[PDB]
Design a protein around this motif. Structure first.
Motif, PDB file in Angstrom:
ATOM      1  N   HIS A   1     -12.441  29.252 -48.516  1.00 38.97           N
ATOM      2  CA  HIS A   1     -12.318  27.762 -48.118  1.00 38.97           C
ATOM      3  C   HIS A   1     -11.748  28.232 -46.312  1.00 38.97           C
ATOM      4  CE1 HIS A   1     -13.666  25.607 -51.568  1.00 38.97           C
ATOM      5  NE2 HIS A   1     -12.632  26.880 -52.504  1.00 38.97           N
TER       6      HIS A   1
ATOM      7  N   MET B   1     -11.054  25.706 -42.894  1.00 44.63           N
ATOM      8  CA  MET B   1     -11.134  24.046 -42.574  1.00 44.63           C
ATOM      9  C   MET B   1     -11.235  24.576 -40.773  1.00 44.63           C
ATOM     10  SD  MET B   1      -8.961  20.922 -41.918  1.00 44.63           S
ATOM     11  CE  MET B   1      -7.970  21.870 -41.271  1.00 44.63           C
TER      12      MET B   1
ATOM     13  N   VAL C   1     -15.231  21.345 -43.091  1.00 43.65           N
ATOM     14  CA  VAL C   1     -14.276  21.871 -44.492  1.00 43.65           C
ATOM     15  C   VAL C   1     -15.910  22.237 -45.121  1.00 43.65           C
ATOM     16  CG1 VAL C   1     -13.533  21.533 -46.501  1.00 43.65           C
ATOM     17  CG2 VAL C   1     -12.657  20.473 -44.630  1.00 43.65           C
ATOM     18  N   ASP C   2     -15.507  23.968 -45.018  1.00 46.08           N
ATOM     19  CA  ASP C   2     -16.817  24.641 -45.459  1.00 46.08           C
ATOM     20  C   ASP C   2     -17.491  24.990 -44.308  1.00 46.08           C
ATOM     21  OD1 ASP C   2     -14.540  25.049 -47.770  1.00 46.08           O
ATOM     22  OD2 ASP C   2     -16.159  24.485 -48.932  1.00 46.08           O
TER      23      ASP C   2
ATOM     24  N   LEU D   1      -5.967  21.017 -45.132  1.00 49.01           N
ATOM     25  CA  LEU D   1      -6.992  21.222 -45.595  1.00 49.01           C
ATOM     26  C   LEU D   1      -6.912  21.459 -47.259  1.00 49.01           C
ATOM     27  CD1 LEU D   1      -9.673  23.146 -45.894  1.00 49.01           C
ATOM     28  CD2 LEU D   1      -8.836  25.273 -45.242  1.00 49.01           C
TER      29      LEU D   1
ATOM     30  N   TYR E   1      -7.647  17.815 -47.468  1.00 50.15           N
ATOM     31  CA  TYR E   1      -9.592  17.222 -47.909  1.00 50.15           C
ATOM     32  C   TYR E   1      -9.795  18.384 -48.983  1.00 50.15           C
ATOM     33  CZ  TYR E   1      -7.741  16.399 -42.869  1.00 50.15           C
ATOM     34  OH  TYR E   1      -7.662  15.467 -41.464  1.00 50.15           O
ATOM     35  N   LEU E   2      -9.284  19.782 -49.291  1.00 52.28           N
ATOM     36  CA  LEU E   2     -10.179  19.781 -50.441  1.00 52.28           C
ATOM     37  C   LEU E   2      -9.965  19.582 -51.816  1.00 52.28           C
ATOM     38  CD1 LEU E   2      -9.304  23.986 -50.060  1.00 52.28           C
ATOM     39  CD2 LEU E   2     -11.219  22.934 -50.098  1.00 52.28           C
TER      40      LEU E   2
END
Ligand SMILES: *[C@@H]1O[C@H](CO)[C@@H](O[C@@H]2O[C@H](CO)[C@@H](O[C@@H]3O[C@H](CO)[C@@H](O)[C@H](O)[C@@H]3O)[C@H](O)[C@H]2NC(C)=O)[C@H](O)[C@H]1NC(C)=O
Lengths: 376, 100, 464, 274
Positions: free
Chosen positions: D3, D5, D28-29, D166, D169-170
């Protein structure tokens, strides 16, 4: 034999922004006084003395009557190398007193040569006979392959040589015989991707980060003279180059508190083979497909359509709707695409009239390559 | 400076069945700089009222957009994506092929 | 408040008016100097009423800067009585600088005016050198002060006239006693040692101190490490801390001394010490004991010549592991520790991989000739040679007297007899002349090699 | 799986008295989740994924303030660069910054980079300590940043906050970011030239986009002639790709298409079917 190279002096203008100012580098020929340059600021008119003789030898071979090389210089203060692999080159927490004084880095670049030299100018210009500033060359690094083009799948040999004349010291000479250990770093930075490809410190056999992508380098001094000057080689050998390995290669020779960098633009290419067939299964003339196969890079391909006349007649730009396919990608990193022509309903005889597509691409000659429909 | 010419793909969101509704896409990507002109084309004419995504950004410094409109594919109708950029000597046209 | 700005014009003059001064020789371009600047100004302000801090820009003032042999920046030197009195090698921080000059500020030898002051002085974690005199009017007292000033950076000196003290520690009002640290006392040596020469001189005092200050097994620390390291010396590394694990620190130290005594008494010559695995975690990399660092001690020896020997067995609580180790060493039956890769499993030909561990077993197997190539993984010449050097091995895969060998000299120490200037460097060690091996310096071509093996090779070569 | 950011900043000068257009977009991704745009009346950072609606007004305030600060920094930078390179209309200055994590959700790499005119200008190297800079402008920049310990500041930002945010957010957007839509694959048949037929292996409906399509002939990999198109977005959040190979008519079934993807327990194997 340029003798004098016009050069831009780049300065941090009051931190408000960089600005360029005219200067010149005069390679000392020996006998004869220098040409007066009242158009130039005496501080930026440099009489260059090069004990190593690498700078001067680079321009003796320079093809007379070639365009002037691009030249830039700027002031710099010696800093230690912040890279881990280069930590042994300065294993103390002090700075050498030998590096006292002003330093200039010169960068000269042209289609045949890219060079970087570290100069030490005097603090004030000689006032008689000619207003010129005496300067001496400490380190020179240069490539004779500044823009190598490599066939996809072939080896790339990136030229690099350097020279060093230890800077004069106030006192306490090293008294240490033998060329000193240096560092060599080869890196690639291109379209947001960066990798240390190879690092080495000849003269210190500590462990270096592993070399990548099959890379090696001929990193060595040329002699073991006990005093100098000394010349060396840092030529990079990258096997079976693929497209992902294209771009800017940065080569830096590191000596204590002194860094010399030159850059190279490696271009990968594979010429496109072209063929022409009726798109439909032997299909209002059939749609024609100009297949352009297995080429790199993808940009630059121009697909021209022409209706070639028979005996008597001549070529004319073909009529009817034309378009392209999307790019198709292969394992080696090369691409293929197809051009498409729909000719209009034939409304007249045309003996010998054959349709042909012509492609142009930087890998090809100016005339390009072409194909007529195979009348099997 | 490093300029890069747009890469183009034109395709339906779902496998085209004739008479069934769908979305015609034109994916334009890997171009630099960002000024670009894209237009979907139905039988030569500009499909107006085409909607696009906002300008996007790739790790290689290149830009990309997705232009799209809803559409019902017939047998006779033919669609294309027309693109223009500074890297191009003339506008580039890519014809929709429902098998690609 | 301020650092004093000294120049070639006013150095000799102001160096006297103090009785010491910290003088920073520098150049404005030196980044080490650039960060020192505010720390040195912070030091000066806090030590204003004590010692003066001076700075000399050497680009301007070349004479004064060369006068004291400056080669790099920043150089910080202590000048007491306007004379070089050693450099400052502590950290370039305000805390470091004020700490150090404080110690340097005081007298070379502390006067102890009462018995209480005396008791205080010897309760230190480090040793005390105490002079006992009836008054200040002997030449002996003057010699003691001379020694004290000479060696003040290395040892703690004190003197007293207190009558009770002079009469308990000497028999003619002229004595020196060396008091070893209280928490370090043991059954193997005395707490105190008296100076026994008839005449007292600064020279003889230095000799007396050097030979008797540490004893059989001192606790090595950041202070004394320089004075302890230098001669053949065994260190046992563990959680030595006399404010936390005293019983534990004593135990292992006692067991080291117990074994040391056995060998020392037999005539064997070796120095011993204990040291914290924490305070000296760095020295472990030279030995490979980074992983091995728990309650049980770890041991390694470093000879004055440079050789290193590391104890492999775990340190048994009874000392018998340490006994065997030390027995093997003095017999000459311990292989020296060297940077090495993991020796590989098979190592079949045609070329023999050579790590430093199995070097002397392969390259120095006498009656067996060896061609040894010192290569680096990054070198292009070394890459060009590789298939030619392997083909050479194949054409010699029957003659066992001739062995073709290679070693990554970036991943493996190269023994003293051999030297690798650049890459590749190829040595040929004769059947018997393994001690004085000679370089190749011939053309790097298969034919050049086999034609060279038809010459230096004492035994006839097998071309296959 | 891995993954990342990434924040992409972008200034584009416009010919005339006008001011540069500054867009800043966070991913993100490969999923956009915040955007700022100088041209928009009332330029503030807006949420661009629904899982960012949780963050309160103090988040958008702080982030919007940072953006306007960067816009000013880009504005002066553009003018300076214009100076050194001696140009007259439209020029482009780009920054990228962010952090890649592995499957362990730990820092695998950190990024701080710039480009002028689509060309790498200066970049923080993998060691998060040294910089790469090709030409003399960027070399002069690099010496300034070395003497100011820029790298230390960014190492500290990237190594701690970047991963911190990150992670947040994930977790907040897991329902879509940790989703694994599996590819629906099928092979098509198209006659080509004489006694030849293009076999096209499709993969539709797949997130993430990471996908490998491979072709075989009796369990042997076909690399030389095989044709791929770039993975492309369907426009519904999913992705599409195909790989094609030419084979004689009548020998179709000797060839098989294997697909590799996260959502697959083991890789699919396919053939052409009447
Ligand atoms: C830095 O090192 C590289 C690698 O050693 C040098 O490249 C090499 O240069 C030599 C010539 O000096 C090449 O030799 C070639 O031999 C053939 C056959 O006689 C001849 O036809 C060629 O014209 C050439 O002379 C060699 O192939 C080439 N590459 C290698 C050895 O892999 C480079 O010249 C060095 N740069 C210096 C010393 O400035």
């Amino acid at each position: 034999g340029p003798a004098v190279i016009e050069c831009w002096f780049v300065e941090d203008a009051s931190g408000k922004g960089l600005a360029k100012r005219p200067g010149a580098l005069l390679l000392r020929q020996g006998p004869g006084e220098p040409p007066p340059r009242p158009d130039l600021d005496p501080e930026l008119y440099l009489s260059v003395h090069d004990p190593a003789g690498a700078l001067q030898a680079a321009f003796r071979r320079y093809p007379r009557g070639a365009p002037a090389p691009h030249c830039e210089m700027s002031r710099f203060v010696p800093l230690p190398a912040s890279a881990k692999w280069a930590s042994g080159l300065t294993p103390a927490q002090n700075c050498p007193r030998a590096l006292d004084g002003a330093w200039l880095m010169v960068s000269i670049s042209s289609p045949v040569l890219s060079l970087s030299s570290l100069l030490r100018p005097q603090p004030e210009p000689q006032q008689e006979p000619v207003l010129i500033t005496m300067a001496t060359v400490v380190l020179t690094v240069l490539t004779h392959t500044p823009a190598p083009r490599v066939r996809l799948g072939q080896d790339a040999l990136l030229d690099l040589s350097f020279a060093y004349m230890p800077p004069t010291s106030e006192a306490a000479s090293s008294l240490a015989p033998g060329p000193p250990p240096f560092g060599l770093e080869w890196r690639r930075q291109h379209l947001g991707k960066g990798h240390l490809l190879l690092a080495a410190t000849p003269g210190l056999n500590g462990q270096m980060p592993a070399a990548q992508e099959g890379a090696v380098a001929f990193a060595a001094w040329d002699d073991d003279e006990p005093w100098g000057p000394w010349t060396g080689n840092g030529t990079f050998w990258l096997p079976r180059v693929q497209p992902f390995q294209e771009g800017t290669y940065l080569a830096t020779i590191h000596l204590p508190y002194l860094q010399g960098q030159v850059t190279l633009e490696l271009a990968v290419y594979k010429p496109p083979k072209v063929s022409l067939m009726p798109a439909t299964l032997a299909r209002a003339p059939p749609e024609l497909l100009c297949l352009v196969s297995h080429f790199y890079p993808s940009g630059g391909l121009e697909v021209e359509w022409e209706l070639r006349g028979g005996p008597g007649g001549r070529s004319q730009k073909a009529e009817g709707q034309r378009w392209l396919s999307a790019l198709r990608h292969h394992s080696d990193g090369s691409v293929s695409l197809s051009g498409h022509l729909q000719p209009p309903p034939v409304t007249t005889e045309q003996h010998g009239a054959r349709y042909a597509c012509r492609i142009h691409h930087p890998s090809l000659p100016a005339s390009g390559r072409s194909a007529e429909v195979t009348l099997e | 400076m490093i300029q890069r010419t747009p890469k183009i793909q034109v395709y339906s969101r779902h496998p085209a069945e004739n008479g069934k509704s769908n979305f015609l896409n034109c994916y334009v990507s890997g171009f630099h700089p960002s000024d670009i002109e894209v237009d979907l084309l139905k039988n030569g004419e500009r499909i107006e009222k085409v909607e696009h995504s906002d300008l996007s950004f790739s790790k290689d410094w290149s830009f990309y957009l997705l232009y799209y409109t809803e559409f019902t594919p017939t047998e006779k109708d033919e669609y294309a994506c027309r693109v223009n950029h500074v890297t191009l000597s003339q506008p580039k046209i890519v014809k929709w092929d429902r098998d690609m | 408040s301020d650092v004093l700005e000294l120049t070639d014009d006013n150095f000799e003059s102001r160096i006297s008016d103090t009785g010491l001064m910290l003088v920073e020789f520098f150049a404005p371009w030196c980044g080490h100097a650039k960060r020192l600047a505010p720390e040195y100004e912070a030091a000066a302000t806090r030590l204003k009423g004590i010692v003066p801090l001076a700075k000399v820009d050497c680009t301007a003032n070349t004479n004064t800067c060369n006068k004291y042999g400056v080669s790099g920046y920043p150089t910080l030197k202590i000048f007491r009585d306007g004379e070089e009195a050693g450099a400052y090698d502590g950290p370039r921080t305000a805390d470091g600088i004020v700490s150090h000059l404080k110690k340097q500020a005081g007298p070379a030898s502390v006067p102890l005016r009462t018995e209480e002051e005396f008791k205080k002085f010897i309760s230190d974690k480090d040793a005390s050198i105490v002079g006992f005199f009836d008054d200040s009017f002997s030449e002996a007292h003057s010699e003691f002060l001379k020694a004290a000033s000479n060696l003040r950076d290395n040892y703690r000196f004190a003197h007293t006239n207190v009558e009770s003290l002079v009469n308990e520690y000497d028999d003619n009002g002229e004595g020196i006693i060396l008091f070893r640290p209280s928490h370090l006392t043991n059954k193997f040596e005395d707490k105190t040692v008296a100076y026994t020469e008839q005449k007292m001189t600064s020279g003889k005092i230095k000799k007396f101190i050097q030979e008797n200050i540490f004893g059989i097994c001192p606790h090595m620390t950041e202070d004394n490490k320089d004075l302890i390291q230098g001669k053949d010396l065994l260190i046992a590394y563990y959680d030595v801390d006399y404010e936390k694990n005293a019983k534990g620190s004593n135990y292992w130290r006692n067991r080291v001394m117990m074994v040391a005594k056995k060998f020392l008494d037999a005539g064997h010559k070796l120095n011993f010490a204990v040291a914290s695995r924490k305070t000296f975690s760095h020295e472990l990399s030279d030995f490979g004991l980074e992983s091995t660092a728990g309650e049980i001690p770890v041991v390694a020896i470093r000879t004055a010549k440079g050789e290193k020997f590391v104890m492999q067995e775990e340190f048994s609580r009874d000392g018998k592991a340490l006994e065997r180790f030390l027995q093997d060493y003095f017999d000459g039956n311990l292989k020296r520790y060297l940077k090495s890769e993991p020796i590989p499993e098979s190592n079949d030909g045609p070329v023999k991989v050579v790590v430093a561990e199995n070097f002397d077993e392969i390259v120095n197997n006498e009656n067996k000739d060896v061609l040894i190539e010192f290569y680096a993984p990054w070198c292009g010449h070394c890459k060009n040679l590789e298939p030619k050097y392997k083909e050479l091995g194949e054409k010699l895969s029957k003659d066992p007297n001739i062995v073709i060998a290679k070693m990554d000299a970036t991943a493996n120490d190269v023994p003293s007899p051999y030297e690798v200037r650049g890459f590749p460097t190829i040595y040929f060690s004769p059947a018997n002349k393994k001690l004085n091996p000679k370089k190749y310096e011939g053309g790097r071509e298969l034919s050049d090699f086999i034609s060279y093996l038809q010459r230096e090779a004492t035994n006839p070569p097998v071309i296959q | 799986g891995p993954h990342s950011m990434r924040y992409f900043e972008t200034a584009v000068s416009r010919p005339g008295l006008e001011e540069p257009r500054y867009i800043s977009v966070g991913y993100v991704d490969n999923k956009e989740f915040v955007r700022f745009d100088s041209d928009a009346e009332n330029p503030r950072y807006e949420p661009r994924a629904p899982w960012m609606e949780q963050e309160g007004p103090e988040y958008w305030e702080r982030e919007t303030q940072k953006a306007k600060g960067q816009e000013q920094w880009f504005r002066v930078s553009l003018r300076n660069l214009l100076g050194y390179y001696n140009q007259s209309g439209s020029h482009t200055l780009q920054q990228m910054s962010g952090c890649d994590l592995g499957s362990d959700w730990r820092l695998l790499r950190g990024y701080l980079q710039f480009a002028y005119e689509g060309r790498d200008y200066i970049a923080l190297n993998e060691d998060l300590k040294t910089w790469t800079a090709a030409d003399m402008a960027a070399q002069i920049t690099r010496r300034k940043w070395e003497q100011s310990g820029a790298a230390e500041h960014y190492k500290a930002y990237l190594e701690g906050e970047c991963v911190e945010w990150l992670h947040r957010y994930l977790k907040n957007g897991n329902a879509t970011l940790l989703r694994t839509d599996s590819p629906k694959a099928h092979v098509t048949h198209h006659p080509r030239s004489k006694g030849e037929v293009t076999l096209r292996c499709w993969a539709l409906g797949f997130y993430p986009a990471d996908i490998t399509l491979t072709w075989q002939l009796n369990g042997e990999e076909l690399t030389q002639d095989m044709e791929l198109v770039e993975t492309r977005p369907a426009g519904d959040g999913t992705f599409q790709k195909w790989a094609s190979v030419v084979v004689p008519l009548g020998k179709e079934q000797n060839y098989t298409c294997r697909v590799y993807h996260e959502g697959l327990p083991e890789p699919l194997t396919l053939r052409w079917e009447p």
